[PDB]
């Protein structure tokens, strides 16, 4: 039953990015590191995180920032391992195969960048920067983390920024 999956998915919360009352994206924290896409600009909803100094990634199109120690407990847990199957995402479950994550066509658009992908246990596997519809499914320009502790950004051909 998908209802329980949706209920588990809708448990945790993220911090959106605002620009003049418009939500251009989301800014999540995982493992004590603040993340938000660089191409998406705005002000983070929470003032404290918005006050943090951040640095830019030229080829990765996102910013990073260390959360304060007194708040690092309240962070999402990551997973370098990505078993084959379907994963929970805010809009809906994500069916992924061949190392690339796919969503039903017509799901996800601008302002949905940066929303993390959760596993069955709630650990974040990867975050999405954009996606392109290529037929019945829509491949997503997600950035994943490798087992060794590295960062990987699988971007499909001529993908669309969100």
């Amino acid at each position: 039953k998908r209802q329980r999956m949706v209920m588990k998915l809708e448990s945790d919360k993220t911090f959106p990015i605002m620009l003049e009352g418009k939500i251009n994206g989301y800014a999540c924290v995982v493992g004590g590191k603040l993340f938000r896409p660089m191409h998406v600009e705005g002000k983070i909803d929470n003032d404290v995180l918005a006050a943090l100094k951040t640095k830019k990634a030229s080829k990765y199109d996102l910013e990073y920032a260390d959360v304060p120690q007194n708040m690092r407990a309240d962070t999402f847990k990551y997973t370098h391992e990505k078993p084959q199957g379907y994963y929970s995402w805010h809009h809906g479950a994500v069916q992924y195969e061949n190392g690339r994550f796919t969503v039903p066509k017509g799901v996800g658009a601008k302002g949905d960048s940066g929303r993390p992908i959760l596993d069955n246990q709630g650990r974040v596997v990867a975050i999405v920067l954009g996606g392109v519809n290529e037929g019945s499914r829509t491949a997503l320009s997600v950035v994943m983390w490798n087992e060794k502790g590295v960062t990987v950004k699988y971007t499909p051909e001529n993908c669309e920024q969100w």
């Binding site: 960062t151 990987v152 950004k153």
Partner: protein, 49 residues
Amino acid sequence: HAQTFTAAVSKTAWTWLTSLLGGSAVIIIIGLVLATIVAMYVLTNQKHN
């Protein structure tokens, strides 16, 4: 004899000219090598396999 086109001034002159013109070329080569190896480093960090 007034022919003066090269007229090598001294061995020290050519040595210094090689040192300060050519060592810059070496530094350029080192920088290019570093850029290439870090590009391959990014490639392998993204997907070595």
